[PDB]
Amino acid sequence: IVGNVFGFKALRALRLEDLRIPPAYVKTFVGPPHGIQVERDKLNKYGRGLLGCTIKPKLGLSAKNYGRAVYESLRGGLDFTKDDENVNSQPFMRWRDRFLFVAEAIYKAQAETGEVKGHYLNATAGTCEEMMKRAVCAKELGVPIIMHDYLTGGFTANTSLAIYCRDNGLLLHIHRAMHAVIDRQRNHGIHFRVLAKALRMSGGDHLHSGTVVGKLEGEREVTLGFVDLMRDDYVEKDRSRGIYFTQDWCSMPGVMPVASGGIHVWHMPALVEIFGDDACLQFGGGTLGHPWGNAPGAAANRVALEACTQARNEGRDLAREGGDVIRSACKWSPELAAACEVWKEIKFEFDTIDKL
Amino acid sequence: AGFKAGVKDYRLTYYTPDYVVRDTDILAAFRMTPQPGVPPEECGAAVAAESSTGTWTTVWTDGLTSLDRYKGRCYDIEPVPGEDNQYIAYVAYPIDLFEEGSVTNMFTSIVGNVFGFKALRALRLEDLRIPPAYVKTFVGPPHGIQVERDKLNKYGRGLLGCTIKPKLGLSAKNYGRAVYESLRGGLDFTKDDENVNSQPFMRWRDRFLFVAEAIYKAQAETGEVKGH
Amino acid sequence: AGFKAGVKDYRLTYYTPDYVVRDTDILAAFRMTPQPGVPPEECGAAVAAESSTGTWTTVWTDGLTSLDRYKGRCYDIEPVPGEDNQYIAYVAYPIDLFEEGSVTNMFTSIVGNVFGFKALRALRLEDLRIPPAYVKTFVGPPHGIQVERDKLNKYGRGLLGCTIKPKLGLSAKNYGRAVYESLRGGLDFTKDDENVNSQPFMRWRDRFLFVAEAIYKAQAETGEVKGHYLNATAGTCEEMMKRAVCAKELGVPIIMHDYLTGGFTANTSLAIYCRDNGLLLHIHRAMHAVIDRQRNHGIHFRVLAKALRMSGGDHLHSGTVVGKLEGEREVTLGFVDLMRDDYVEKDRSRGIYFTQDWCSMPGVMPVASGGIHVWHMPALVEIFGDDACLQFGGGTLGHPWGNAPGAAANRVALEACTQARNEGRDLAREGGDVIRSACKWSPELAAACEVWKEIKFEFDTIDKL
Amino acid sequence: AGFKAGVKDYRLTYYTPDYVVRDTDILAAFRMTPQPGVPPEECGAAVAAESSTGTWTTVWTDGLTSLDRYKGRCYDIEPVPGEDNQYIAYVAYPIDLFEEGSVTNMFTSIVGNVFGFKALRALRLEDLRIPPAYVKTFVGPPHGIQVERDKLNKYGRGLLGCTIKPKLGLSAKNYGRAVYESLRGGLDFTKDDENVNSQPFMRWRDRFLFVAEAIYKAQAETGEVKGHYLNATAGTCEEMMKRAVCAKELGVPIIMHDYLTGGFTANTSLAIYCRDNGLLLHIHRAMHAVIDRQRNHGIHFRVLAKALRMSGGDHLHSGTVVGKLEGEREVTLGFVDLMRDDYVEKDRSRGIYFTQDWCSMPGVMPVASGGIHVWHMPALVEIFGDDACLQFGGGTLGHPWGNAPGAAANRVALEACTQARNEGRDLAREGGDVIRSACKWSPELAAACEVWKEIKFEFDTIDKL
Amino acid sequence: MMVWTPVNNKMFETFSYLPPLTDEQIAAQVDYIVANGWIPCLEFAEADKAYVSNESAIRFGSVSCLYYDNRYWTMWKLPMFGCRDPMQVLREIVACTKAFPDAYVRLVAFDNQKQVQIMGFLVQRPKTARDFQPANKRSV
Amino acid sequence: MMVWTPVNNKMFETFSYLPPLTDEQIAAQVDYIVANGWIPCLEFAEADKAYVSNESAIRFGSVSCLYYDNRYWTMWKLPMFGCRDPMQVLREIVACTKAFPDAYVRLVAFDNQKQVQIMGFLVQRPKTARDFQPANKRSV
Numbered sequence A: 001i002v003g004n005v006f007g008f009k010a011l012r013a014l015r016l017e018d019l020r021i022p023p024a025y026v027k028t029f030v031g032p033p034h035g036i037q038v039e040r041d042k043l044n045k046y047g048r049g050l051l052g053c054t055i056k057p058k059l060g061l062s063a064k065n066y067g068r069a070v071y072e073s074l075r076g077g078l079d080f081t082k083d084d085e086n087v088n089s090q091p092f093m094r095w096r097d098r099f100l101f102v103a104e105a106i107y108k109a110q111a112e113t114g115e116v117k118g119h120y121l122n123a124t125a126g127t128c129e130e131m132m133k134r135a136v137c138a139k140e141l142g143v144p145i146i147m148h149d150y151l152t153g154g155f156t157a158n159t160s161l162a163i164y165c166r167d168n169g170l171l172l173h174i175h176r177a178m179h180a181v182i183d184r185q186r187n188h189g190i191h192f193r194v195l196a197k198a199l200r201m202s203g204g205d206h207l208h209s210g211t212v213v214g215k216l217e218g219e220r221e222v223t224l225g226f227v228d229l230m231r232d233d234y235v236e237k238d239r240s241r242g243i244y245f246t247q248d249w250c251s252m253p254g255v256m257p258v259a260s261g262g263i264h265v266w267h268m269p270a271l272v273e274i275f276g277d278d279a280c281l282q283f284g285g286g287t288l289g290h291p292w293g294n295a296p297g298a299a300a301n302r303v304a305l306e307a308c309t310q311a312r313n314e315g316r317d318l319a320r321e322g323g324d325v326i327r328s329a330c331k332w333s334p335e336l337a338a339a340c341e342v343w344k345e346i347k348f349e350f351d352t353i354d355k356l
Numbered sequence B: 001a002g003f004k005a006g007v008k009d010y011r012l013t014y015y016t017p018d019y020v021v022r023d024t025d026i027l028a029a030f031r032m033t034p035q036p037g038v039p040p041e042e043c044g045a046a047v048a049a050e051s052s053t054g055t056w057t058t059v060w061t062d063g064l065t066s067l068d069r070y071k072g073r074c075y076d077i078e079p080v081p082g083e084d085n086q087y088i089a090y091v092a093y094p095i096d097l098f099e100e101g102s103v104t105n106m107f108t109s110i111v112g113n114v115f116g117f118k119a120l121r122a123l124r125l126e127d128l129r130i131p132p133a134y135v136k137t138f139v140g141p142p143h144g145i146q147v148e149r150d151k152l153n154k155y156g157r158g159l160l161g162c163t164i165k166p167k168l169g170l171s172a173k174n175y176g177r178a179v180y181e182s183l184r185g186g187l188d189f190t191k192d193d194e195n196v197n198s199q200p201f202m203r204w205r206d207r208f209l210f211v212a213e214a215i216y217k218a219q220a221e222t223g224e225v226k227g228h
Numbered sequence C, D: 001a002g003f004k005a006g007v008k009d010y011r012l013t014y015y016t017p018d019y020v021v022r023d024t025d026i027l028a029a030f031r032m033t034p035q036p037g038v039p040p041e042e043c044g045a046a047v048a049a050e051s052s053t054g055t056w057t058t059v060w061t062d063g064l065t066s067l068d069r070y071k072g073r074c075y076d077i078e079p080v081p082g083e084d085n086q087y088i089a090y091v092a093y094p095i096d097l098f099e100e101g102s103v104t105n106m107f108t109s110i111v112g113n114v115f116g117f118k119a120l121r122a123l124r125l126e127d128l129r130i131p132p133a134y135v136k137t138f139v140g141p142p143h144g145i146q147v148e149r150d151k152l153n154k155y156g157r158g159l160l161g162c163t164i165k166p167k168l169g170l171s172a173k174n175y176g177r178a179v180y181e182s183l184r185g186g187l188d189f190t191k192d193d194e195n196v197n198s199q200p201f202m203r204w205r206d207r208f209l210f211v212a213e214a215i216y217k218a219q220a221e222t223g224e225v226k227g228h229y230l231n232a233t234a235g236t237c238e239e240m241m242k243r244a245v246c247a248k249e250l251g252v253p254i255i256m257h258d259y260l261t262g263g264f265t266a267n268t269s270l271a272i273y274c275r276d277n278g279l280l281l282h283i284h285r286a287m288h289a290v291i292d293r294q295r296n297h298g299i300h301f302r303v304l305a306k307a308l309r310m311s312g313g314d315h316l317h318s319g320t321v322v323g324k325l326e327g328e329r330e331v332t333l334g335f336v337d338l339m340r341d342d343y344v345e346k347d348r349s350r351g352i353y354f355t356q357d358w359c360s361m362p363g364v365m366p367v368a369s370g371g372i373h374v375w376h377m378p379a380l381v382e383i384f385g386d387d388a389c390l391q392f393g394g395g396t397l398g399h400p401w402g403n404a405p406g407a408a409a410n411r412v413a414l415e416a417c418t419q420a421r422n423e424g425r426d427l428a429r430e431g432g433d434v435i436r437s438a439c440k441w442s443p444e445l446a447a448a449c450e451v452w453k454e455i456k457f458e459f460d461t462i463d464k465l
Numbered sequence E, F: 001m002m003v004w005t006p007v008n009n010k011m012f013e014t015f016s017y018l019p020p021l022t023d024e025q026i027a028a029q030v031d032y033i034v035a036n037g038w039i040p041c042l043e044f045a046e047a048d049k050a051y052v053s054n055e056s057a058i059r060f061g062s063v064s065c066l067y068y069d070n071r072y073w074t075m076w077k078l079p080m081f082g083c084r085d086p087m088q089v090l091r092e093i094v095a096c097t098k099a100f101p102d103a104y105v106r107l108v109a110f111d112n113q114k115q116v117q118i119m120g121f122l123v124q125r126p127k128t129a130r131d132f133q134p135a136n137k138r139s140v
C-alpha cells in the first residue's frame, strides 16, 4: 500500500488517510498480547486511568540512580514508570544493570504501597537477538511489563516481540517514536490512525495516543477518533473525526492509549474528560520536576487524578468545573498545592498543523 | 547551583553557539520551520534538548549526573536563502548517547520525538555526520561492492537486474518460468517484487525452489553466474 | 614503479619521520636495543614492517594493494638518556590492521614476531595509544568500578579481600570454613588462590558449594554483602564456562580468571558471559612478571593493563608498591590512572608515553595484594584512595587468633585510616600514629601490630623508568 | 607442632636438599638471580613456596592439611659457571597440585607469581620434567606427525609451506589468487599470516571460501593433496569455533591458531575440536620471543614447546637457525627432539635439563619459517631431516617470476637436497654444489638463486646456553 | 519540603489517596453504578489475604510474570444482577460488614459488555489495622 | 585469644568497626563532603528494611546474581545540590531523625562526575535494636 507510490513523478504529494482492515484479514493476526481488559485484570486495577512517568534526564543517568528515581516515583502513587524511548543500552547505563536495579525498585514500591507496580523496561535494540535477550531477562525477573519502539525497531521485530509477550505473559508497552516524521503534515505521509491500526494488528498492550493539550501536536477530534479505533470493537465511518471507513475489529483486543508529553496537574481534568478511565496518563517532568522530589510528585498526580475521577462519578462536568476540582484538592493536599503553584501559568497553545 | 523547579527556556542550556564540535560527536542538520513568535535559537535548542537529555520543565535528577557531558547541543543556526521562516539548525550529540551498533537507537534519539513538537511547523533531517568512532561499532554490509564483484566474478560493467511482473498474482512455477527466460537472455539478476513475500497465489518456499531451478538452468546455459 | 625482486632496506618504505599521526591510528612505543652496526632508523623500520605489512624481501603482491594505506610507520626515534645503544621507537598502525574487539589480534600484530629478530638485542613495548575509534569496538569490562560499588552497596572506603592459604592442599569443606571465618570478621571478599582450579585434593564444584554456604552465612551474620572470587580458570573454554554457569546458578556475586595463563580469547568470552549474566569478574595477572619485570625486554604492565581493560575485567591486580612483589611507586600510580580514569594525559615521569582517551569505557578496580599487613594500611590508602581492593591473605590467616579476628584487625585499620584522611590528617606522615591509636583501642589490631611490627619489603627496584 | 604466628625463613620448610624425587613429580629448573644478601637456599625456597603452598607469614590452616604431602620442594641448587650471582634451582611439585589436562593450571602454579618477587633480580624457567602420569591426563595433539603424513599421503621429504604477503592489506580474492599460484607450483601448504584474522580489508569467511576454491584448483591441477592453514585465531572462543566450523564444512584439511596470543585455554578447546572433527592444527608461536629471548629472565622456548605439545598441536614453529629470527643450533636440535620424539635423554649441552618420557603422546611437526630461501635448503634439510615443514613466504612471493615459479624453485631445491642426502652426499659440505647442479638444470631455481645469492642472517646470538 | 512516609502507608487502589469517603460520597458512587447499569458486587478478605503477595511462586518455574496471590477476594453472596436500587446495595454493605467485622471489604461493579470490573473501592478495613496513614500524616 | 561473636553482631558498612561517631566526628565528615564539593543526602528505612535480604528472588529464574532487596532506602527530601554549608546538613540530620525516631538513618554523599555515591555512614539506629554489639563486647 505505501511501498512505491509516494515517490512517483506524476504526483506532487500523497497521504494515506485511512485503511479498512476487513475482519477476514484481522483474523490472520495474533494481535496484542493481552489488551485493555486482560491488562486491568492482571494488574488488579479498575475504576480510574493508569498513571505513569518517564525517568529524566532522558539519557545520562546510571543504573542505580535510574532505580532510585523509579522507586521514589512508584511509591508516591504512580502505577508505572518507564525507560525513556532512547534509553536502551549505553556507556553510562547498560541494560542489564538497569533491569536488575529497576526490579529491586518495583518490588520495594509494591511492598511499601500494597499496590501492583511496574516499569516499562525497554527491549528496543539493534538486532532481534538483542531484543529477545532483554525480553528474556524481564521474564526471568518476574516483572509485569516491557516496552518497544515499534517504528524505529520495525514491524517485523515488533510482531516477534508481541508473540513472545503473549507466550510468556508480559505486558507490552508501545512507544511511537518517529511517527511525526511520517504523520505530521496534512499533504504528505501516513496519518497516525493508520499507524495505530497497524500497531494494533502487529501487537501492543499500550500505544501512545498524544495528549491534545501537552507539548506535542494532537487535534482533539482526530485524537478522539483514533482512540476509538485503538480501543473499540466496532467504529462507524465518521468524517468529522477523520474516520473514512467503518472498522470492524472482530474481537481483537483493544490497545490502551497513553497520553504523555508536557502534561501536569492542571491538565488532569481535560485528560480525564478526553480519554475516560481506559488510558494511561504519564508525567515525566510532571513528576521529576516537582519541588519536593518524585514521591510527592507522584502523590500530587495521583491525588489530582482521583479527585477528577470522584468528581466525574458525582456528576460534575470536568470541561467546566475542572479548575474548581483541582483547587479544592489543592487546599486539601500540600503535595498537589506545590505542584499547582509551580505549573499554574504553563500552557501549550499553538496553531494546529495536521488539520482535518 | 541548586535545584530550581519550574519551566525555563531551552536555549539557556541547549543553545551553545561557541561550542567546538568533537571528532567523536554525531552531528545533525535539521531544516527547521518554527511557529510564529518562536525564536530560531529557542526552536533549535528544543530540538537539541528533546532528542538528547531534556524535557519541558526542570528536573532535579540533572544534578546527579553531568549535563555538560551528555546534552545535545545546538551549536549553529543557518538562515535558508529564499525563505522567511526556514533555518538549518546544527546539533551535536556526544557519542555516549548512542548504543553501539544500533541504527534503531540513533534514529530513536535524533528523530524520535522532535518532529511532533507544537512549537515547530515542520522539521526535516537533512544530513548526519557519523564519526569513525561510531561507524566502527557496526558490523555493516555483509560483503559490499568489492567482495560482491569478486564472488560473482563480474567486472568491467554495470550489473543488470529485472523485477518479475505482474507485481502480484503469478504462481511459483510461472515465477520460475519468467526468471529462467529473463536470466538466460543476459541479465545477471532477477528479483521478487518488493511486495512478493508469501501469499495465497504463491507461497514463498514453492517460489524459492522453482527459482533455484531457474537460476541453475540459466547459469548452465549461459556459462555466467546468475542470481535472483 | 614496478615490481623489483630482491632485498632492500626496511627504512626505504617503513621509516617516515615526517608522518603526521592520525587520531584513529594505534601508536606503539618500543624500547629498542639494536645489534652493533644496525642503524636505529633501520631497526625501527624493521619493527614497523614485520608487525604490519612487510617481510625480508620485496614481494610483487604489494602492487595489488596500497602499502601507503596499510603499512605500519616508524615516525619518530628518541635517544634514551644514560644509554649508548637504546632508543624509543614510535610506530603508528592504521586502524584497518586490527580485528574489532580482539586484544588477541592487536597483540598478534604489535608483539607477534618482532621481539625475536636477529637484528636487535632486546625490545620492550612500553606503551600503546588505543584510539577512541578502536576502544569502541570492545565490549570491555562487565561492570566496572561504579556499577560494582552500586551492586555491592559499598561506598566511602577501599574494599577488603583475602586469599585463602595454604595456596594448595585444603579440602573444600576447610576452604569454606576458612572463607566463613574470614568474611564474618569484616572482609568484603575472599578468593581462590590463582592456582586453585580443580585438583585431586579439592574439586571445583565441591568448593563452589561450600563457599556459597560460607558466603551466605557470613552475609546473614554481618548484614553486609559478601563475596568470594570463585576461580573459573580452566584447561578448556567448556570447563571455564561450566564453572561460570555454576556460580550463576548459586546466585553468588563474583568469579575470577587468570587472564594471561588462561589467555585473552578465553578471557573475553568470560567477560561477555559475565556481562550477560550479571557476574563480577576479578582478574588475576598470574604470569605478568615473566613478561614485564625487566627494563630492557618484554611488555610493560601498563600495556598488559590496557589490554585487560579492553578484553574485560571488573578487578585487576595492580601491585602494592610496599609488599613482597615489585612495583615502583610512580609507575604504579601511572597505570592505576590508566586502569581507572576516562582520560589520562601524557606524563613521562610516570611512564605514560601517550595521552589515553578511554571514551567512557568503565574503569577497572585496582587490587593491591601480596605481602601486606596492617602497618601497610596508611601507605596503601594514600597510594590508591578509596577505589581499590586491598587483600590480606597471610595478613589474615596469619593472625594469632584466627581468621575472624584477623579480618577485624584489617577492617579496623582500613576504617581508622579512612576516618583519619577524611578528618584532614596526612597518611604519608601520621600513618604510624593512626595505627597506634587504633591499636590501643582494638585488641584484634593490637595482636596484628605486635606480630608484624618489624616486617618490611625493601629491595632495589629492577623495573625502573 | 602447634600454630605459631609470624614470619620465618622459607628454607625451614621449603629447602629440602635430601629429598628423593618421585617418578610422578613435576620438576622445574629455574635460572635464579637473587638480590644481594639473599642466600641462594632462601631464594630457591621462596620460589618453591610461592609456586605451591606457602605465603609470606605462617598460617594456621597448614595444620588442617599435610604440608609434607603438598609442598613444592627446592631439592638441589646448582652454581652457574661464569656467573657470580646466578644459580640453577631445582623444584619438585607433587602431582596432586595440578589439574588434569590443564596447561593453564601448570603454568599458573609454576610461573604464576614467583617472577615478580622483590627478593630476586631475575628468574628464568629453563626446563620442566612432565612425568608420564601427568602426560596421560592430556588429550594432546589432534593427530601428530605419523597420522598427518598418513592423511596427506606424503612421505620421504620435508613438507613445504609459504606465508602469503604482504602480511595485511590483501583482499580475500587476491589472497586466494596468491594461494592458488603458490600451491600449484609445488608447495604442499600455504598459510594465513599470524595476524591475518578478520579485518576491514578482508573478512574471514570471504577468505576461507576463496582459499577453498584455490586449494581445490591446485589439488586438481597437480594431483597432490593441498592445504592452507586457515586462521581460527579470534577475540572470543565463540568466534574461534565458528571459524573452525566453517573450515570443517568446507572439507579443507588444516587450520591454525596462535596459541600464546589466543591462550592455552582456547588452544586446548580448539585442539579437542580438531580431534573430534579430523582437522589438522597448525600452531603459530606469536609472542614467544617476548617470553623466551633473554638468557636471564623469562621461560625458555623448550618449555613453551612442551606446553604446546600437551595442549595440542600438529605443527609448531621451531625457528630456522639460519633465517631472520634468532635460534641457536644446539638448543634448537634439543627442543626439536622434545617436540618429535617419544623419549629424550637429559643432555645439558643441548639445554635438556631433564629426561623426558612422553609415554606415546604423538609428536608435533616442527615448522622452520622466517627469512629463508633456496640457498638455506641444504642447511635446513640437514638440521631437521624429513619430519619438518619448511616455509617460504618472501622466498616464494618474492621470486622474480611470481608464486608458481617461486614454489617450483623451493620444491626443486628441497627434492634435490633430499635426493643428494639419500645418495650419501654430506649436505653440510656439498650443500652449495647440490643447489648449483640443480640451478644449471632448473631455470625457476636459477632465477631464485641469482636474486638471493648474497643474502645471509648472521648476528651475535642472545639466547645462549 | 515534605517527605512522603514509607512506614505503614499502605494504600488500596482507587480513591485511597483521597480523604476517607463519607456515607454521602459512598452513596454517590453507588448512584453512579446504578445510573450506568453496572452490576454491583461485594468482596471481602481477612487481613492476611488483603495485599498482593508471592508465596505460590515457590512452586513455579520461570512463569511468575503477572502472577500474584491475593488478587482474588471472597465474593459476598452473588453479583446483584438487575439491581436498580441504590438502597439495596447500601443494605448489602451493612449486612456484609456485620457478618465480617474484622475483614477488609470492597465494593466493586461489573460491566458485562466489556466483561470487566469497571469500578471499585474499599468500604471497610479492620479497626486493628496499623499499616495505613490518615491523609494529614502521609507526609512529614 | 579472643573470639569474635557471631551473635547479634550486625554491622553497617563504612565506619561501623570504629567506636560510635561523636557529634564532632560526624561534623568533620560533613566538612569533608563540603570541602570536596560532593552532594549530601539523607536516607532512612524502618527496621525490617534495613538489612539486605532475598525475598523477591522467589519470583526469579536463575538471575539472582547481585540482586538484593533493601539496598535502596527511602530518600529524605532531595539531595542537597549546591550546598556549601555544613550547618545546613547537620540541621537536616536533626530534622530527619526527629520525623523518624524509630528508623535507621544514614548520611551519604554523591559525586556527579563519577556519578556514584562517594561516601556514607549510619547516623541513627532505633533504640529498640538488639542485633548489634558495643565495640568492647564484639569479642569475648
Ligand SMILES: O=C(O)[C@@](O)(COP(=O)(O)O)[C@H](O)[C@H](O)COP(=O)(O)O
Pocket: A054, A056, A084, A085, A176, A177, A208, A209, A210, A211, A216, A258, A259, A260, A261, A262, A263, A282, A283, A284, A285, A286, B050, B055, B056, B113, B116
Ligand atoms: O521523551 C518524552 O518527551 C516523553 O518521555 C515525555 O516526557 P515528559 O513527560 O517529561 O514530557 C515521551 O516519550 C513523549 O511523550 C513521547 O511523545 P508522544 O507520546 O506524543 O509519542
Ligand SMILES: O=C(O)[C@@](O)(COP(=O)(O)O)[C@H](O)[C@H](O)COP(=O)(O)O
Pocket: C163, C165, C167, C193, C194, C285, C286, C317, C318, C319, C320, C325, C367, C368, C369, C370, C371, C372, C391, C392, C393, C394, C395, D050, D055, D056, D113, D116
Ligand atoms: O598467591 C599470592 O601470593 C597472593 O594470593 C597474595 O597472598 P598473600 O596476601 O598471603 O601475600 C596473590 O595472588 C599475589 O598478591 C599475586 O601477586 P600480584 O598482585 O602482584 O599479581
Ligand SMILES: O=C(O)[C@@](O)(COP(=O)(O)O)[C@H](O)[C@H](O)COP(=O)(O)O
Pocket: C050, C055, C056, C113, C116, D163, D165, D193, D194, D285, D286, D317, D318, D319, D320, D325, D367, D368, D369, D370, D371, D372, D391, D392, D393, D394, D395
Ligand atoms: O610473519 C612472518 O615473518 C612469517 O610468516 C615468515 O614470513 P617470511 O617467510 O616471508 O619470512 C612467520 O610468521 C615467522 O616465521 C614467524 O617466526 P617464527 O617461526 O620463528 O615463530
Ligand SMILES: [Mg+2]
Pocket: A054, A083, A084, A085, A086
Ligand atoms: Mg520519552
Ligand SMILES: [Mg+2]
Pocket: B163, B192, B193, B194, B195
Ligand atoms: Mg518492485
Ligand SMILES: [Mg+2]
Pocket: C163, C192, C193, C194, C195
Ligand atoms: Mg594467589
Ligand SMILES: [Mg+2]
Pocket: D163, D192, D193, D194, D195
Ligand atoms: Mg607470519
